[PDB]
mmCIF file of C-alpha atoms and ligand atoms in Angstrom:
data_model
loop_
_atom_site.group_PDB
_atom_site.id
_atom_site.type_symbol
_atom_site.label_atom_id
_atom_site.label_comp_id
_atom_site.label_asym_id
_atom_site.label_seq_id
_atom_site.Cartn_x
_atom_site.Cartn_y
_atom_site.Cartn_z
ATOM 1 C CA UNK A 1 3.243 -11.859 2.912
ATOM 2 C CA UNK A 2 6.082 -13.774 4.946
ATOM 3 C CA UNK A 3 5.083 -13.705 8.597
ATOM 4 C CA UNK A 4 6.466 -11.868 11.866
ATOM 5 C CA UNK A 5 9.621 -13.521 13.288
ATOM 6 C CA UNK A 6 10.377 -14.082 17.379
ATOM 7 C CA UNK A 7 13.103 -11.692 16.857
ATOM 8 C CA UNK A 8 11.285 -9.219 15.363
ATOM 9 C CA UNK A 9 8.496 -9.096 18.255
ATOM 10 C CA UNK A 10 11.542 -9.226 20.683
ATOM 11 C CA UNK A 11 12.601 -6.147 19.536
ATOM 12 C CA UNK A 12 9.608 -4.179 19.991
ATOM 13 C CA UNK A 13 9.037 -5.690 23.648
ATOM 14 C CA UNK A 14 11.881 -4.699 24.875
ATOM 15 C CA UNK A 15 11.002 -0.914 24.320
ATOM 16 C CA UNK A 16 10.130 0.845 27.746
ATOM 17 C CA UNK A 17 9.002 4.365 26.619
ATOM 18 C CA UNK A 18 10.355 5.413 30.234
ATOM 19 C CA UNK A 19 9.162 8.710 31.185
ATOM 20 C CA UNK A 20 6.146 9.097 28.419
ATOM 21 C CA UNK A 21 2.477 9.046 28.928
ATOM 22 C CA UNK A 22 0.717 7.833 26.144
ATOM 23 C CA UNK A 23 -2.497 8.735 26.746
ATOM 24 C CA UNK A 24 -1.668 12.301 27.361
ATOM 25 C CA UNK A 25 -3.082 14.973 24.808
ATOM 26 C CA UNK A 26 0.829 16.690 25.100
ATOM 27 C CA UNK A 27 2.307 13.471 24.294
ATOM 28 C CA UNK A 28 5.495 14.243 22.007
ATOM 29 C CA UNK A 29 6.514 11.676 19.522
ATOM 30 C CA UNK A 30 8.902 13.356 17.850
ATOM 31 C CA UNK A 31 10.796 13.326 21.201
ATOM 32 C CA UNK A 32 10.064 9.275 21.446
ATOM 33 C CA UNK A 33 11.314 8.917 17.937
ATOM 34 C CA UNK A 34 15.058 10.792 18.997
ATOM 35 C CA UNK A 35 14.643 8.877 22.795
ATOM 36 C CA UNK A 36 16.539 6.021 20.958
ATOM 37 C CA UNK A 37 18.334 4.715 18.301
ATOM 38 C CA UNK A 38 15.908 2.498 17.243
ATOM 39 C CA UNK A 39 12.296 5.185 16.268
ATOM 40 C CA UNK A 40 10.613 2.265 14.810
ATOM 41 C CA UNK A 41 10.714 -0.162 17.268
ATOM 42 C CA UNK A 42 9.309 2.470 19.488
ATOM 43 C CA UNK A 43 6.990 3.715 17.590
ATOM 44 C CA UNK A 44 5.369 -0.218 17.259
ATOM 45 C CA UNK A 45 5.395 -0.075 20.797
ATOM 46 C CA UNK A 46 3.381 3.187 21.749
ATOM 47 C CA UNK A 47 1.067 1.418 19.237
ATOM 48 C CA UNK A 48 0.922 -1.605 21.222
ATOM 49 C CA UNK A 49 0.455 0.092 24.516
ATOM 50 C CA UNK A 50 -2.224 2.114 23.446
ATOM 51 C CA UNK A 51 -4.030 -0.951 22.112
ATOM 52 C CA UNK A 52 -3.568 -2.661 25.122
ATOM 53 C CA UNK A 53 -4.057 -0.339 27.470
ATOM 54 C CA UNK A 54 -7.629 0.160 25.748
ATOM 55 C CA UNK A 55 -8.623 -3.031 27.178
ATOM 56 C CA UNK A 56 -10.079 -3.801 24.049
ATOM 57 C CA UNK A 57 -8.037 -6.846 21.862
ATOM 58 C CA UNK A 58 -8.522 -8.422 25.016
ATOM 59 C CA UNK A 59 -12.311 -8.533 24.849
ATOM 60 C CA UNK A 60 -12.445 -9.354 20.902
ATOM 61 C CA UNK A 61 -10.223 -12.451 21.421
ATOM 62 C CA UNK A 62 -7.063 -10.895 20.177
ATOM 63 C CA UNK A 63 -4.384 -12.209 21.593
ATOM 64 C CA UNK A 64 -1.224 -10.097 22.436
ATOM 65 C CA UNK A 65 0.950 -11.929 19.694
ATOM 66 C CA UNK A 66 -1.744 -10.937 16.749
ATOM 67 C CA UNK A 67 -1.863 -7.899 18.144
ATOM 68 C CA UNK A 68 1.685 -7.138 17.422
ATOM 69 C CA UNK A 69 1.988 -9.299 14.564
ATOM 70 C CA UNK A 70 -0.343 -6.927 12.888
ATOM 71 C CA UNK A 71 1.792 -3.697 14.164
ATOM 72 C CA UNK A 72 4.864 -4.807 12.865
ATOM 73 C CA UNK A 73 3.065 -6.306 9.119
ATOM 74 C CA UNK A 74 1.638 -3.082 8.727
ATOM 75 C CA UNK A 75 4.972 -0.954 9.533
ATOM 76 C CA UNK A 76 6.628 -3.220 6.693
ATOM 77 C CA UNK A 77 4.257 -1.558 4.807
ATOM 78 C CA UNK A 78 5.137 2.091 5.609
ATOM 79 C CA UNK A 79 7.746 3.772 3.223
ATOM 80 C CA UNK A 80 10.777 6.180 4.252
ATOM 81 C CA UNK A 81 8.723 8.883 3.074
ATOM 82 C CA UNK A 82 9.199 12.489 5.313
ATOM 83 C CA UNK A 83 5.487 12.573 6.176
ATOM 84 C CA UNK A 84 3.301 9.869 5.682
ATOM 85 C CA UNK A 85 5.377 7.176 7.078
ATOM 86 C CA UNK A 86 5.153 4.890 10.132
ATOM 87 C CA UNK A 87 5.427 7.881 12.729
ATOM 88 C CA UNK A 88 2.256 9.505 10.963
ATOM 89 C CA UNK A 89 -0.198 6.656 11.564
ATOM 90 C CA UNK A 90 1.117 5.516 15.097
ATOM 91 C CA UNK A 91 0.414 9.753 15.392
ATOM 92 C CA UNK A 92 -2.944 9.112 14.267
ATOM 93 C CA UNK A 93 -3.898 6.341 16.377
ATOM 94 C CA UNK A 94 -2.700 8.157 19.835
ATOM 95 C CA UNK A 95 -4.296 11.057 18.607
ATOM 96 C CA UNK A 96 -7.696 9.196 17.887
ATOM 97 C CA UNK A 97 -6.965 7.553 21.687
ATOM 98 C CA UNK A 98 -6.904 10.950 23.280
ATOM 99 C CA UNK A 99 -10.425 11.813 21.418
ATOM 100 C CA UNK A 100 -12.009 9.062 22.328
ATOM 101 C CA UNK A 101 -11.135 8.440 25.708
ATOM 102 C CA UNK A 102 -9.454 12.098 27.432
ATOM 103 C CA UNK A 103 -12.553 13.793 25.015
ATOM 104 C CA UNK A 104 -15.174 11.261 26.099
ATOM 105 C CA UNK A 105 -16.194 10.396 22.592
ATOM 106 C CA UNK A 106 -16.030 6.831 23.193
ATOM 107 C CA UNK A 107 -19.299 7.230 25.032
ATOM 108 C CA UNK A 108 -20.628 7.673 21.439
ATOM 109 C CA UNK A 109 -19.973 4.525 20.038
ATOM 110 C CA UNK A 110 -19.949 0.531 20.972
ATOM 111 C CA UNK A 111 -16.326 -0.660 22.064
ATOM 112 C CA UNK A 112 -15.842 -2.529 18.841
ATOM 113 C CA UNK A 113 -16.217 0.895 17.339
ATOM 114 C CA UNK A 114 -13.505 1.920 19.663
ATOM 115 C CA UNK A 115 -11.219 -0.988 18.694
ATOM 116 C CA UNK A 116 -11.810 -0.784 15.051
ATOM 117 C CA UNK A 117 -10.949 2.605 14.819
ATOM 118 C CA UNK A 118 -8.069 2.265 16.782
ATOM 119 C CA UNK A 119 -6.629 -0.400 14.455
ATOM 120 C CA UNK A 120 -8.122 1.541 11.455
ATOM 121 C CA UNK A 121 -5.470 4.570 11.858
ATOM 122 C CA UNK A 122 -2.560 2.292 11.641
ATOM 123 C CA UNK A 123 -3.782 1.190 8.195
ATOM 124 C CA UNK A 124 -5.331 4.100 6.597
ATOM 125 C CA UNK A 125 -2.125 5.302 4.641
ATOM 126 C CA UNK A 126 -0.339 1.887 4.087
ATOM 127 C CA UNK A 127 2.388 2.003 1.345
ATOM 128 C CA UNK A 128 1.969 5.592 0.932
ATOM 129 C CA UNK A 129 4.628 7.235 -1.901
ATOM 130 C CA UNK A 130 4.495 10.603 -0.701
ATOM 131 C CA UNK A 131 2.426 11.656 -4.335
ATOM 132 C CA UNK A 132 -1.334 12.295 -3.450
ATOM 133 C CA UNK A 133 -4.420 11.090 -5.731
ATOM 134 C CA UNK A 134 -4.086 14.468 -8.260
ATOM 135 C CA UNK A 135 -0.169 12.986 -9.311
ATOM 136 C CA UNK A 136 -1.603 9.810 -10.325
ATOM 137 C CA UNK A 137 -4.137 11.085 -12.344
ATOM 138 C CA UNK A 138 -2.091 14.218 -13.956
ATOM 139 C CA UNK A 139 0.575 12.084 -14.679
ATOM 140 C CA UNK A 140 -1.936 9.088 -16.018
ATOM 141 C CA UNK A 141 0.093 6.774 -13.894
ATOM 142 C CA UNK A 142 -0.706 2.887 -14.257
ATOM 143 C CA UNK A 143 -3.021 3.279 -10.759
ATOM 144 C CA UNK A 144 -4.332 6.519 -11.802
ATOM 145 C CA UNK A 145 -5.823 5.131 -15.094
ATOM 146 C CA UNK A 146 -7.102 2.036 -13.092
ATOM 147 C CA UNK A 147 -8.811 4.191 -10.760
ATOM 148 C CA UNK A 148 -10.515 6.312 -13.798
ATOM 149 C CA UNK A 149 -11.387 2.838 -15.691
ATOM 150 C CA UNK A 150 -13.089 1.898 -12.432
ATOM 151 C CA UNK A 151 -15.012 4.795 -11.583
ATOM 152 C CA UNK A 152 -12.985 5.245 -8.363
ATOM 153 C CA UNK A 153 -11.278 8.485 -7.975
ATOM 154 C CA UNK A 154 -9.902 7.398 -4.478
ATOM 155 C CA UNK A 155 -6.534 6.448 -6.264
ATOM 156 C CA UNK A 156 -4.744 5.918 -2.536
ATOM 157 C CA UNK A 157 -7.290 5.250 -0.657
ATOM 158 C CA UNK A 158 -8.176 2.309 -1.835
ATOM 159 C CA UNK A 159 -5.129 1.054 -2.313
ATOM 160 C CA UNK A 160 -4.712 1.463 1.461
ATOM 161 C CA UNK A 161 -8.045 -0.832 1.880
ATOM 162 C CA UNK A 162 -6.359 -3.046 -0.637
ATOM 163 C CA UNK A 163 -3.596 -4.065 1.643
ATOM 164 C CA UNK A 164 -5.172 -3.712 4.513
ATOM 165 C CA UNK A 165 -7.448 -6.485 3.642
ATOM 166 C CA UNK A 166 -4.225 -8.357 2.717
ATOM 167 C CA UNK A 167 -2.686 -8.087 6.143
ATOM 168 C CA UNK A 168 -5.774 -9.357 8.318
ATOM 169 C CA UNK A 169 -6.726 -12.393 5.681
ATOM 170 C CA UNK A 170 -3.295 -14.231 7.354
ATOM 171 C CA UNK A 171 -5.220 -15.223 11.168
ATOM 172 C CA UNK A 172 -1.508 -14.921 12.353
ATOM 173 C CA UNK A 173 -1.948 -10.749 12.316
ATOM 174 C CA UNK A 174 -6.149 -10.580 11.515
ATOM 175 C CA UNK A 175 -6.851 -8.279 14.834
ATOM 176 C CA UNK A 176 -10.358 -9.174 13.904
ATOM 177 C CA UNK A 177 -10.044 -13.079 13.975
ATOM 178 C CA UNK A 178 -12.233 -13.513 17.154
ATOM 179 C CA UNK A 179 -15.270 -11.805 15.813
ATOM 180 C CA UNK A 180 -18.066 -13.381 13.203
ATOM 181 C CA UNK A 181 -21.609 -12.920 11.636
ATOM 182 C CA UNK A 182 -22.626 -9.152 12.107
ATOM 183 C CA UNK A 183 -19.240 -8.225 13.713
ATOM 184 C CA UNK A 184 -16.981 -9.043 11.919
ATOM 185 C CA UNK A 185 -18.526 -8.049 8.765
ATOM 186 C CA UNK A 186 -19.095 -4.341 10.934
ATOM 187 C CA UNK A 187 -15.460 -4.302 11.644
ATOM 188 C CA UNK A 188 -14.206 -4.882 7.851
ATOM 189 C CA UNK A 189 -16.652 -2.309 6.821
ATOM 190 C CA UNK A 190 -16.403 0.286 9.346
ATOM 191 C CA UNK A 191 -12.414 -0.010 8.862
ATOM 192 C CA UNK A 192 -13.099 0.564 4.797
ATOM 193 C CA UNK A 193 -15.595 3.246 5.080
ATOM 194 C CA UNK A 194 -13.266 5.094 7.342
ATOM 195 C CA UNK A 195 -10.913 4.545 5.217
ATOM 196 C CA UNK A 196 -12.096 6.213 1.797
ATOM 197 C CA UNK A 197 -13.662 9.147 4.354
ATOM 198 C CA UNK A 198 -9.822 10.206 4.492
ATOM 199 C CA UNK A 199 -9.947 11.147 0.830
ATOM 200 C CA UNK A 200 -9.877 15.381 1.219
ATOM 201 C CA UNK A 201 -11.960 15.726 -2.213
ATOM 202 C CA UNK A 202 -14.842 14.222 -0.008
ATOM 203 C CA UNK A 203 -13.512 16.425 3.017
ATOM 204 C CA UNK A 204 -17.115 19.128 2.952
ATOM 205 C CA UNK A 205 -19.503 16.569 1.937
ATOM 206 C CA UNK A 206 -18.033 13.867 5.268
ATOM 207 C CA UNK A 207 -18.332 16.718 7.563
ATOM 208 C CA UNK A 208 -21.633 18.285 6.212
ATOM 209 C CA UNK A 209 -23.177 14.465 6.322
ATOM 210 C CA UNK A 210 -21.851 13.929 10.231
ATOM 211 C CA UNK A 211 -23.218 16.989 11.015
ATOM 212 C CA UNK A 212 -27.034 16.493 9.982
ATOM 213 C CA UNK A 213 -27.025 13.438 11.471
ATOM 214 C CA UNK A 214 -25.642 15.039 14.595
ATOM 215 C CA UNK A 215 -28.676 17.737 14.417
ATOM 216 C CA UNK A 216 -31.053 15.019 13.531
ATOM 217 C CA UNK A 217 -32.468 13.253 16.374
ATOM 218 C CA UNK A 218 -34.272 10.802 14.449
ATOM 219 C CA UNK A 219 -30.720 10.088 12.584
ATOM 220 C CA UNK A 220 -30.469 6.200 12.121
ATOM 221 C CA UNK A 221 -28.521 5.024 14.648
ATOM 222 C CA UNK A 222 -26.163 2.805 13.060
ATOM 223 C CA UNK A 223 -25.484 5.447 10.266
ATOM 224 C CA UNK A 224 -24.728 8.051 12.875
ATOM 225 C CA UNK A 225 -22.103 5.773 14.373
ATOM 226 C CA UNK A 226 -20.494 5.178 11.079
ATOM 227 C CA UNK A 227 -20.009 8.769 10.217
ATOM 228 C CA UNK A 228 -18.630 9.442 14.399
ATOM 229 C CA UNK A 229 -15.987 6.691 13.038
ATOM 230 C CA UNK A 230 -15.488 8.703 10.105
ATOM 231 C CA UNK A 231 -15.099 11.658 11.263
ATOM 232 C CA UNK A 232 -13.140 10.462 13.843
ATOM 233 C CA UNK A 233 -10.433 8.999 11.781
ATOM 234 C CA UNK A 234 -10.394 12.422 9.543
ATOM 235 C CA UNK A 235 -9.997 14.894 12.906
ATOM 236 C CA UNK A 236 -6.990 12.227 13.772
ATOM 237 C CA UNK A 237 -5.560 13.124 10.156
ATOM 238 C CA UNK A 238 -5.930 16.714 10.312
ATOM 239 C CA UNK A 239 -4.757 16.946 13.971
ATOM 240 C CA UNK A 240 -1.775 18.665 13.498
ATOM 241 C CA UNK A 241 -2.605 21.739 14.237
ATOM 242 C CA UNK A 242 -4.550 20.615 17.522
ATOM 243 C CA UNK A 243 -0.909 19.857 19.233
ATOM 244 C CA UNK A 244 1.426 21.844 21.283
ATOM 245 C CA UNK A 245 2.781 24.461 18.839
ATOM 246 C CA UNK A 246 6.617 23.202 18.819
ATOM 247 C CA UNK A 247 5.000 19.443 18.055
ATOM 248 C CA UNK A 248 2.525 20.854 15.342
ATOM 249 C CA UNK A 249 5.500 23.081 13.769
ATOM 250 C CA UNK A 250 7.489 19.680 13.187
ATOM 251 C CA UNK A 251 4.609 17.804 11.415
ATOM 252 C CA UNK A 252 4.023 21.220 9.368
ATOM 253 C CA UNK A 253 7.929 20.694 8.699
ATOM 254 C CA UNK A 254 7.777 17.535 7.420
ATOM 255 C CA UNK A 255 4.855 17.811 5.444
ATOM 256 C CA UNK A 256 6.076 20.431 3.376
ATOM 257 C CA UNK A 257 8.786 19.020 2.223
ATOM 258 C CA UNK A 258 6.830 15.853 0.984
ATOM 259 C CA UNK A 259 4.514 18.111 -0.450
ATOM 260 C CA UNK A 260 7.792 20.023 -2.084
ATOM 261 C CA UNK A 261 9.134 16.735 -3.403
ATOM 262 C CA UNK A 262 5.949 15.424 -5.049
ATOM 263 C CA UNK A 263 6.092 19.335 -6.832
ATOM 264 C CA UNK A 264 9.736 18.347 -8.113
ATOM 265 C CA UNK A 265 8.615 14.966 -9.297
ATOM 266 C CA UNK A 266 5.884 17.485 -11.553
ATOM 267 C CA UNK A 267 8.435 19.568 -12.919
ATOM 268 C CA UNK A 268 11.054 16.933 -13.924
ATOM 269 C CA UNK A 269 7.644 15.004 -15.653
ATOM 270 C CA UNK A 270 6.191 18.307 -16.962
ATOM 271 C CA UNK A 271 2.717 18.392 -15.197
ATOM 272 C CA UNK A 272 0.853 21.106 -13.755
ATOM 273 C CA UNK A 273 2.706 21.817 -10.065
ATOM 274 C CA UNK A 274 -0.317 24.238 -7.494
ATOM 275 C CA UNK A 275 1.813 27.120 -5.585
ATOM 276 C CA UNK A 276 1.447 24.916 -2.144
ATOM 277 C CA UNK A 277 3.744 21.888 -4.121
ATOM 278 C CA UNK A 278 6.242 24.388 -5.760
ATOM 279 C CA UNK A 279 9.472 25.263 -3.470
ATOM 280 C CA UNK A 280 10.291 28.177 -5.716
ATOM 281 C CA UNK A 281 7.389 29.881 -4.447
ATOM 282 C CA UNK A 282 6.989 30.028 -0.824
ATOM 283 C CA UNK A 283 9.316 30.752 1.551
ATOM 284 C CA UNK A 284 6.953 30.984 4.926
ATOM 285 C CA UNK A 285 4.933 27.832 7.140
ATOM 286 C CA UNK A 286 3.839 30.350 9.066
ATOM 287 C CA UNK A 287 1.100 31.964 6.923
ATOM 288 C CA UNK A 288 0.255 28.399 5.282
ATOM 289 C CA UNK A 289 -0.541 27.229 8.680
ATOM 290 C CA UNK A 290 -2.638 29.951 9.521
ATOM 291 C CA UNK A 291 -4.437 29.463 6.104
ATOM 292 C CA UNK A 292 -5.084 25.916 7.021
ATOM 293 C CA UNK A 293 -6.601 26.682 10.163
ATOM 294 C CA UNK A 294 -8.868 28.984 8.862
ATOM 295 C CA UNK A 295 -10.002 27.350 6.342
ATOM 296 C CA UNK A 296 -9.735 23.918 7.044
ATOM 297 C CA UNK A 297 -8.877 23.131 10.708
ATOM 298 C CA UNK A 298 -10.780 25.526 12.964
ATOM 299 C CA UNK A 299 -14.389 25.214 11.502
ATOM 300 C CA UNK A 300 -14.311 21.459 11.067
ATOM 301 C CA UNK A 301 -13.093 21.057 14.996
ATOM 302 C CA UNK A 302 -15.045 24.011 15.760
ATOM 303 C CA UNK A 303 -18.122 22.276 14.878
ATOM 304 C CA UNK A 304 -18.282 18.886 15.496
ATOM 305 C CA UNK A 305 -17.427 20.198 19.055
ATOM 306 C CA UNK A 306 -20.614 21.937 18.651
ATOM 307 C CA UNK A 307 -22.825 19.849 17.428
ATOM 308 C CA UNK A 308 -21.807 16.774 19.425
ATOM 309 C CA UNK A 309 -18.338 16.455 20.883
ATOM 310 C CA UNK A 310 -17.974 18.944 23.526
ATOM 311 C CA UNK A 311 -15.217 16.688 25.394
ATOM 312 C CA UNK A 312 -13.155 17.803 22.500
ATOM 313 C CA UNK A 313 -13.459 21.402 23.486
ATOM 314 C CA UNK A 314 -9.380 21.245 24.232
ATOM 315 C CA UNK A 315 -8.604 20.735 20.126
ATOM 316 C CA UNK A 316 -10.501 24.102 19.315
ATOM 317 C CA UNK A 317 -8.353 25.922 22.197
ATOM 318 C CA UNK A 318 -5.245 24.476 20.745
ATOM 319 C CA UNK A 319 -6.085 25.730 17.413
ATOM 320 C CA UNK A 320 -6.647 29.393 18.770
ATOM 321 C CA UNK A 321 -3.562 29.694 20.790
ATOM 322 C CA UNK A 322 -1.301 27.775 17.841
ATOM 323 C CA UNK A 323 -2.705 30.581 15.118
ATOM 324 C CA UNK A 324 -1.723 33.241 17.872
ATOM 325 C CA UNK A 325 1.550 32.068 17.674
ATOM 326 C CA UNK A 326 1.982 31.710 14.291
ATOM 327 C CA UNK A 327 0.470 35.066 13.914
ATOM 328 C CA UNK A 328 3.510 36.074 16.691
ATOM 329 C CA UNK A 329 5.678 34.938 14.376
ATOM 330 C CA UNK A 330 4.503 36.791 11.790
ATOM 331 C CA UNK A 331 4.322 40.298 13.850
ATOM 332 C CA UNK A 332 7.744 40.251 14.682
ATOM 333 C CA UNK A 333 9.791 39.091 11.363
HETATM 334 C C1 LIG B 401 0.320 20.368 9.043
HETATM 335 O O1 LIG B 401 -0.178 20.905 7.818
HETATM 336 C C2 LIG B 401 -1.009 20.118 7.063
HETATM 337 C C3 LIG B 401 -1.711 19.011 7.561
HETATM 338 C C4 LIG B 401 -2.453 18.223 6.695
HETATM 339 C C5 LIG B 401 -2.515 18.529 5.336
HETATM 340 C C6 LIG B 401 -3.383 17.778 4.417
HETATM 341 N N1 LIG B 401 -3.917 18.510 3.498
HETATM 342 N N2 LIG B 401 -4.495 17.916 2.398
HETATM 343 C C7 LIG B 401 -5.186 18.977 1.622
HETATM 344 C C8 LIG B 401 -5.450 18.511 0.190
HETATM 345 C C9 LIG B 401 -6.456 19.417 2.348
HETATM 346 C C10 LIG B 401 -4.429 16.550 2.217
HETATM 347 O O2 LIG B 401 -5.221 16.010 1.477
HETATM 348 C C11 LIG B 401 -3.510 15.704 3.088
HETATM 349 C C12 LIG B 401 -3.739 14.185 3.132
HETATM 350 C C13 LIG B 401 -4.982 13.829 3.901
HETATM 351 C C14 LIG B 401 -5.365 14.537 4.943
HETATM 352 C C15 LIG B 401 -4.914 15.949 5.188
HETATM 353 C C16 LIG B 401 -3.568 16.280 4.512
HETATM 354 C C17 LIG B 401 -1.815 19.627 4.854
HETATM 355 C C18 LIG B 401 -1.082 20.447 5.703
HETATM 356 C C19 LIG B 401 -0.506 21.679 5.102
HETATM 357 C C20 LIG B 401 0.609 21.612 4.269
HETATM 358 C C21 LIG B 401 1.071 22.728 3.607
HETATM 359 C C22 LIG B 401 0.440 23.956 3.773
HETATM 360 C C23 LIG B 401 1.028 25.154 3.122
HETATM 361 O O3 LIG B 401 0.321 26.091 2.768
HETATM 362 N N3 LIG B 401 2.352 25.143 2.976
HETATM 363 C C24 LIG B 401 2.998 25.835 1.891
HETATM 364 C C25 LIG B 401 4.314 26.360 2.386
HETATM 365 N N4 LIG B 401 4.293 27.090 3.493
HETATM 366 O O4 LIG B 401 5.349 26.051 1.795
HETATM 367 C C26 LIG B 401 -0.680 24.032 4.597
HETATM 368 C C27 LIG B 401 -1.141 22.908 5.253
HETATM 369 MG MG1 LIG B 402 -4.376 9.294 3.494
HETATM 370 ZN ZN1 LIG B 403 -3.216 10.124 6.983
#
């Protein structure tokens, strides 16, 4: 794990993001990513800012050079893949920004809670291939056969802990470095648990748990914060379809065709390929979308708003008025 050059720091420093608010729920980083010739080293710096601008490194004794250090080891880590790249977890991590602090749900949980989950989206899909957990296993890839051996049907997921761990045991990028005892062991834990939440096998059985909890006023307390982490980081992964419609179209774009590509990669190795993978099938976003949303999307925002995070009241809206419009586009092809 060679470490973070001057140069390499310089780079992202230099990056003024004139004329973008990165706190704003209608921030647009597709439009960051074409501002300049250089998407990554942008991208490393909305990260940044938004870390900074929390307040919170500051208060957990990391320093503004670990803070970055850890950026730019865990964009090394991020593969030219047309989805879940770099741009998808720097996404995630302004989108879990705007829940916490435009939709108030920071008032739910301690401010280490706040900082781990901030650093937690940057991590959650390291050294992703663009194949999900069902090619591994279908295939009987090396990883998917270690996963089954261990019990572990999380194939990526933990691999994403897995390097994770890697990057913050070097103190030159461990965001976590200034906590100990009970912290820092909350921190690693809270970051893993979020982590292997993200898996969308355990998608019902997350939300369902969060939920009772939610209802429960006797809930224990530290539980119910874990699973507001949890659910958290999942509504940042699924978030999509909670952004301005020409900004969710372009992540529905992209994730297609990884989706497409992992379907070719079946074919070519002979394994089962579902109609969602296979490009000779569809030929229309808009009704996938809409199926997504219904049966995905709108009930989980719908009710965690509900049943505890009424700031976030804005993400259901969006949802309505995106299906509209992809129902628009359907009424008039
Ligand atoms: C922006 O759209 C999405 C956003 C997220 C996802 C995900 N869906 N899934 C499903 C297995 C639930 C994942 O696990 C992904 C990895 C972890 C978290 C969520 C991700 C899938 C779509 C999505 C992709 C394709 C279709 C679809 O039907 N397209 C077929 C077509 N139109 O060619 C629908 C939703
Ligand atoms: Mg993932
Ligand atoms: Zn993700």
């Amino acid at each position: 794990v060679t470490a973070i050059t001057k140069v390499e720091r310089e780079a992202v420093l230099v990056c003024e993001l004139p004329s973008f608010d990165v706190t704003d729920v209608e921030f647009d980083l597709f439009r960051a990513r074409e501002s300049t010739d250089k998407p990554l080293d942008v991208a490393a710096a909305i990260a940044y800012r938004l870390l900074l601008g929390s307040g919170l490194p500051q208060k957990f004794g990391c320093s503004d050079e670990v803070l970055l250090n850890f950026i730019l080891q865990c964009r090394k880590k991020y593969r030219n893949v047309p989805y879940h790249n770099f741009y998808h977890v720097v996404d995630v991590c302004q989108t879990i920004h705007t829940f916490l602090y435009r939709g108030n749900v920071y008032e739910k949980l301690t401010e280490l809670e706040c900082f781990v989950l901030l650093i937690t989206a940057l991590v959650h899909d390291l050294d992703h291939m663009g194949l999900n957990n069902s090619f591994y296993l279908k295939t009987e890839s090396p990883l998917g056969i270690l996963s089954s051996a261990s019990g572990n049907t999380s194939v990526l997921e933990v691999h994403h802990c897995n390097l994770a761990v890697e990057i913050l045991s070097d103190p030159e990028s461990d965001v976590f470095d200034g906590l100990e005892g009970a912290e820092r062991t909350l921190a690693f834990r809270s970051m893993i648990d979020c982590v292997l939440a993200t898996d969308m096998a355990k998608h019902g059985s997350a939300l369902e748990a969060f939920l009772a909890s939610a209802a429960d006023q006797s809930s224990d307390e530290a539980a119910f914060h874990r699973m507001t982490m949890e659910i958290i980081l999942k509504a940042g992964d699924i978030s999509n379809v909670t952004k301005p419609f020409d900004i969710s179209r372009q992540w529905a774009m992209a994730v297609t065709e990884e989706f497409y590509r992992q379907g070719d990669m079946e074919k070519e190795r002979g394994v089962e390929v579902l109609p969602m993978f296979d490009r000779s099938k569809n030929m229309e976003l808009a009704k996938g979308q809409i199926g997504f949303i219904d049966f995905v999307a709108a009930p989980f925002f719908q009710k965690i708003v509900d049943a505890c995070l009424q700031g976030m009241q804005w993400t259901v809206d969006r949802i309505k008025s995106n299906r509209a419009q992809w129902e628009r586009v359907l009424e008039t092809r």
